Nucleic acid binder design. Structure first.
Ligand SMILES: [K+]
Ligand SMILES: [K+]
Ligand SMILES: [K+]
Ligand SMILES: [K+]
Ligand SMILES: [K+]
Ligand SMILES: [Mg+2]
Ligand SMILES: [Mg+2]
Ligand SMILES: [Mg+2]
Ligand SMILES: [Mg+2]
Ligand SMILES: [Mg+2]
Ligand SMILES: [Mg+2]
Ligand SMILES: [Mg+2]
Ligand SMILES: [Mg+2]
Ligand SMILES: [Mg+2]
Ligand SMILES: [Mg+2]
Ligand SMILES: [Mg+2]
Ligand SMILES: [Mg+2]
Ligand SMILES: [Mg+2]
Ligand SMILES: [Mg+2]
Ligand SMILES: [Mg+2]
Ligand SMILES: [Mg+2]
Ligand SMILES: [Mg+2]
Ligand SMILES: [Mg+2]
Ligand SMILES: [Mg+2]
Ligand SMILES: [Mg+2]
Ligand SMILES: [Mg+2]
Ligand SMILES: [Mg+2]
Ligand SMILES: [Mg+2]
Lengths: 205, 124, 97, 26, 46, 181, 152, 41
RNA sequence: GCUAAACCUAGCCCCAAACCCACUCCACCUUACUACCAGACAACCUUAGCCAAACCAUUUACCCAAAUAAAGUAUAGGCGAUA
RNA sequence: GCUACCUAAGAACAGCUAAAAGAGCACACCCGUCUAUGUAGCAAAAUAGUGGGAAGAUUUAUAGGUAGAGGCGACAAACCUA
RNA sequence: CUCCGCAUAAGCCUGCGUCAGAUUAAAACGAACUGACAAUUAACAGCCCAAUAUCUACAAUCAACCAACAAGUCAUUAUUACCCUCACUGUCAACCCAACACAGGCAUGCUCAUAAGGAAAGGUUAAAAAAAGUAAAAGGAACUCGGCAAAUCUUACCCCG
């Protein structure tokens, strides 16, 4: 389960990983990082959103967010605000220098308007059907949430039922007839097991 | 000098202590003279395994199954699904009476039944 | 050793926040309001310490008399022992008799 | 950690003097 | 002669002298268990 | 036979094995009791196979081909148990009106704490049971002080928690001035 | 079953039946030499040898002749942070003898043949690392440490 | 209000600066240098 | 140059306000955390001392329901300490 | 759970003379006379040699009992967790 | 060398089995340190036995002669009830009580010098003082509070009990 301690410093690594355990040891006790309490209804930055970096290293470049961390209010864009690190380095082999992105706070990124590539301000407004969507305050532009890869990594279109996967028709076939009967009684009657000896009274205390 | 924090099991103590303690297995008989154990077949649990020939269900479900709303089953819902149609039919036909709820499906007392809802005298 | 090697973060005091700006207002409430209310009624704090001053023994006696029934068991026991010790110190020990 | 600023300032000045002694400027 | 080995382990003696039933038999042992519970001891009785 | 404890021989040694989704509560409700019984046995066989595979992977110091399958099977079995329990509880509430299937009572213990005592099955009446009579379900007037002390300790803990929360809120407001609005 | 209240039995009466058992077993490879007809399982404490025999004969339809059970005790010697003993869970080891001369051998669940197939997938980062390491050359001693980047 | 001394370093140095040409531990240990500095004065 | 030195948070304290706890399943008064047999065992009752009186023996403040004032007044006391 | 005493049911005591032994010599076993070593020691009372008893008022395993204004004591003001 | 040793009881609870590391052992590789993985399988023991009435004077000591006093661990019957069976727990180790890998304490069965279990010396030299032993010319207690120690394995007494 990897039960997090009361003060667990989140970082650019998934919890319960080899890197985290090399870091974040169970005996570590560091100063907590104060995080602005953005509510679930106030967080407007999602995965796949094209935001423009403000006040950051790029300060104007627009990129797609690749990872969100609501624990520390972090959104990381792809290929932007990068620093060079040697990965896979050995004693003699210097390693392949690659750019790794640094996390950015919510105040340091502003979502771009789909209508005009300039950044815009997000206001949560419910639609006629009750679907709360991100609306640009500049011109009332609806900003739909970009589609992100599914959590399990299974595309519904690109998925064929396996030998141990129940088909949709079999899973949706309703064969349950409600009745004032128990599972034990139903199984007994179905399998034909017959019992005639009654259960005598036992004192409960 | 004894570890109070450790769990007290059947591996600790003299022979009597080790023999008088169990790991939680339910008894299936009784002891008689000569330290002779008599086993009761009825006390021995009997597994009920159905026939899995032709059973179309599988351990996993395809991801193409559409999502459905979740509605936990309630007593009122069960009464509406099972007893309400018959009760309404009899009421409309005029054959309804307040004395044949047992006919409609009610159980006055759980006594005299192999499976009793309260107290539960049957296993899962 | 025993002294910091870096300067502490600078300390900024908002000399004109609401509390410091309105400190001392309504102090002369009785004088400028036909003595309807006394200035000691504006003091907020412990119920046994409102417009009253005294030494430690008097404070302990007043607290035990006023809120002794509402105190916790350990707190009341400690207060009783403190009162006993203060009584002994102030009535049996000292330099001037 | 002890509350205070004067002692820290004085010790910082002494450290600066020591640094100047260790690395004399041209 | 040589001392320090006054504790000769015996599970039956230990359980009889210090145990849940022994503590609960008398009101004094109940008070001891209550004090241990109030303090927060992991082991209330032997 | 003993083959069912192991996965398919073709799938043996594969890095990853495909698997579907887990049965949901609504899907299991849509099925009958006999179907739920058979599906429970199938899930039990699959769970035994997955546990065997995990244990052998630990033995051979190799990663499990697909740990998520065990979690999916466990979730499906838990959902089946939940559906069966809901049906049983609804039927019991209809027929008798009792919420729980095991009789119980609210009893004060020897330490003065109010607890839920669940009744046990016996053969002799309650008064004739020597071991049951040896138990005390009352508190003599020497536990009131300890109850008061425990209450005061809990009150101290609650007050500490509330004060710490207020201090944290103040620190947060100090660090972020715009949160005042 | 486990963590359930068995109904009390009286002389005569019905038969105790379990419909949805929650006893889960796992076939473990024996750590020592065993007879051919011997199969080793790890089971919870609440499962008896009679229950295991009925389980096997009703669910998996495995003929069973003799079952012998023992209780294996986990090690509590390990000390974690704060010098607190961590208890490795105990279990029950069961040995089952096949009832019709059948022989069981534990199969190799991790064949190297399937673990190293022709069809393999390589990460882009791994491929880039390998290619760059192959391209990069060790410094020749005759250069004496002079960088080998400048064409001059 | 808890008050603690923060300039003990300078207080010690005001005496140790006069005890640096001595011999032994009475030029770096305050409890030994203070007695010799007074005698020197 | 080593050994080392430095840190700012975890949290805690006093008030105020408000009268707090309670049972996924299973086990737990017998050797607690132990599925399952013939009992009768049941609570109530002055606190005493250290200490002060320069010993000590009578005596020696210990919240008992409104802050203050009456008032350290009446009164009690080896008419002493002190109450 | 050490120790002082007691209770219930147990165990051990080679060999030699005499056999009638709260008898003798003498191993296991109990105790600790004298000397030497050690004195932060191997040990908060030990080691080596030498000693007394060793079929009895003996030694000892297990469970229980006597609790401090006391217990218990073949009275040493002993022992009751160094 | 063999003080033992093997097993049970009591006690402790994985505490020198495999693999990957070598922190560490009162030096040091060994591994008793770290992590993971295995394990001890009941016939041996524990866990027993329905009710009401009723019966039980004649020791053990090879138990046969004698011989005792301290007077002794080791039994039933009548009636009613009673078809049913092999469950559960302990099984490892170089191990327990003494702050320790402590020259101490530790109950039984067998072995009586071993078929089982172990190593007094890290290397060198051979000063003083010290400890444990061996041998000694002539004398044999002249030593000393005292034949204390060591050697050989005496006689006659006195006081106290
Ligand atoms: K005074
Ligand atoms: K005095
Ligand atoms: K010793
Ligand atoms: K051990
Ligand atoms: K003389
Ligand atoms: Mg001790
Ligand atoms: Mg003893
Ligand atoms: Mg066994
Ligand atoms: Mg006095
Ligand atoms: Mg005196
Ligand atoms: Mg006796
Ligand atoms: Mg003899
Ligand atoms: Mg004799
Ligand atoms: Mg003799
Ligand atoms: Mg005398
Ligand atoms: Mg005397
Ligand atoms: Mg047997
Ligand atoms: Mg063995
Ligand atoms: Mg002894
Ligand atoms: Mg040998
Ligand atoms: Mg040596
Ligand atoms: Mg040497
Ligand atoms: Mg000579
Ligand atoms: Mg002479
Ligand atoms: Mg002579
Ligand atoms: Mg002379
Ligand atoms: Mg001599
Ligand atoms: Mg005599």
């Amino acid at each position: 389960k990897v039960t997090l301690p009361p003060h667990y410093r989140y970082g650019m690594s998934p919890p319960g990983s080899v890197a985290d355990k090399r870091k974040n040891p169970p005996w570590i006790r560091r100063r907590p990082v104060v995080v602005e309490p953005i509510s679930d209804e106030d967080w407007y930055l999602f995965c796949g959103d094209t935001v423009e970096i403000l006040e950051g290293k790029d300060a104007g470049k627009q990129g797609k967010v690749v990872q969100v961390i609501r624990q520390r209010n972090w959104v990381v864009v792809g290929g932007l605000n990068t620093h060079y690190r040697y990965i896979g380095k050995t004693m003699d082999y210097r390693g392949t220098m690659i750019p790794s992105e640094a996390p950015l706070l919510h105040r340091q990124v502003k979502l771009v308007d789909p209508m005009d590539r300039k950044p815009t301000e997000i206001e949560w407004r419910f639609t006629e059907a009750g679907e709360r969507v991100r609306v640009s305050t500049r011109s009332g532009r609806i900003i739909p949430k970009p589609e992100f890869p599914r959590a399990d990594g299974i595309v519904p279109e690109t998925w064929i039922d396996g030998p141990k996967d129940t088909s949709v028709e079999d899973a949706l076939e309703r064969t349950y007839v409600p009745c004032l009967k128990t599972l034990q009684e139903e199984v007994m009657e179905a399998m034909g097991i017959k019992e005639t000896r009654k259960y005598k009274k036992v004192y409960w205390y | 000098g004894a570890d109070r924090m450790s769990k007290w099991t059947s591996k600790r103590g003299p022979r009597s202590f080790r023999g008088r303690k169990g790991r939680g297995a339910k008894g299936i008989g009784f002891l008689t003279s000569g330290w002779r154990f008599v086993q009761i077949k009825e006390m021995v649990p009997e597994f009920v395994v159905p026939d899995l020939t032709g059973f179309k269900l599988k351990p996993y479900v395809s991801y193409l199954a559409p999502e459905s709303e979740e509605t936990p089953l309630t007593a009122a819902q069960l009464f509406s699904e099972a007893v309400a149609p018959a009760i309404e039919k009899d009421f409309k036909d005029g054959t309804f009476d307040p004395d044949n709820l047992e006919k409609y499906g009610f159980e006055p007392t759980q006594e005299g039944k192999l499976f009793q809802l309260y107290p539960r005298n049957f296993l899962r | 050793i025993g002294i910091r090697l870096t300067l502490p973060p600078p300390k900024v005091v908002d000399r004109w926040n609401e509390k410091r700006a309105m400190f001392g207002v309504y102090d002369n409430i009785g004088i400028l309001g036909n003595f309807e209310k006394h200035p000691k009624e504006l003091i907020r704090g412990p119920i046994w310490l409102r417009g009253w001053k005294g030494n430690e023994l008097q404070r302990c006696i007043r607290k035990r008399k006023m809120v002794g029934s509402r105190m916790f068991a350990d707190d009341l026991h400690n207060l009783n022992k403190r009162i006993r010790y203060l009584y002994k110190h102030f009535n049996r020990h000292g330099k001037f008799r | 950690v002890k509350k205070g600023f004067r002692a820290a300032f004085r010790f910082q000045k002494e450290l600066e003097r020591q640094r100047l002694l260790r690395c004399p400027p041209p | 002669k040589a001392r320090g080995n006054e504790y000769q382990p015996s599970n039956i003696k230990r359980k009889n002298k210090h145990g849940w039933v022994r503590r609960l038999s008398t009101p004094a042992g109940v008070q001891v268990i209550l004090r241990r519970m109030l303090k927060g001891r992991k082991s209330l009785s032997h | 036979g003993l083959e069912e404890f192991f996965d398919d021989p073709k799938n043996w040694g594969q890095e990853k094995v495909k698997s579907g989704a887990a049965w949901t509560c609504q899907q299991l409700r849509n099925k009958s009791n006999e179907d739920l019984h058979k599906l429970w046995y199938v899930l039990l066989k699959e769970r035994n196979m997955l546990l065997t595979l995990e244990q052998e992977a630990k033995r051979q110091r190799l990663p499990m081909p697909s740990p998520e399958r065990l979690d999916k099977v466990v979730d499906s079995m838990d959902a089946l148990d939940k559906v069966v329990q809901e049906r049983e509880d609804a039927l019991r509430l209809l027929q008798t009106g009792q919420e729980r299937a095991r009789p119980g009572a609210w009893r004060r213990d020897i330490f003065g704490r109010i607890i839920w005592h669940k009744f046990k099955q016996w053969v002799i009446p309650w008064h004739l049971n020597k071991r049951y009579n040896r138990k005390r379900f009352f508190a003599l007037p020497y536990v009131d002080h300890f109850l008061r002390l425990e209450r005061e300790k809990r009150a101290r803990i609650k007050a500490r928690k509330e004060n710490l929360e207020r201090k944290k809120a103040k620190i947060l407001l100090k660090k972020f001035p715009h949160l005042a609005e | 079953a486990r963590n359930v209240v068995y109904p009390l039995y009286r002389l005569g009466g019905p038969q105790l039946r379990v419909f949805r058992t929650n006893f889960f077993i796992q076939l473990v490879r024996p750590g020592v030499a065993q007879p051919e007809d011997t199969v080793q399982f790890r089971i919870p404490m609440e499962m008896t040898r009679v229950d295991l025999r009925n389980y096997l004969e009703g669910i998996y339809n495995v003929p069973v002749a003799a079952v012998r059970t023992r209780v294996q005790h986990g090690s509590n010697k390990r000390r974690d942070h704060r010098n607190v003993r961590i208890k490795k869970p105990d279990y029950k080891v069961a040995y089952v003898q096949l009832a019709h001369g059948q022989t069981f051998t534990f199969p190799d669940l991790f064949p190297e043949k399937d673990e190293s197939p022709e069809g393999s997938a390589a990460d882009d980062l791994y491929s880039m690392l390998e290619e760059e390491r192959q391209q990069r050359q060790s410094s020749d001693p005759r250069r004496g440490g002079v960088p080998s980047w400048f064409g001059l | 209000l808890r008050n603690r001394v923060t300039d003990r370093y300078f207080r010690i140095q005001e005496v140790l600066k006069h005890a640096r040409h001595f011999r032994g531990r009475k030029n770096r240990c305050y409890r030994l240098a203070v007695r010799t500095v007074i005698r020197a004065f």
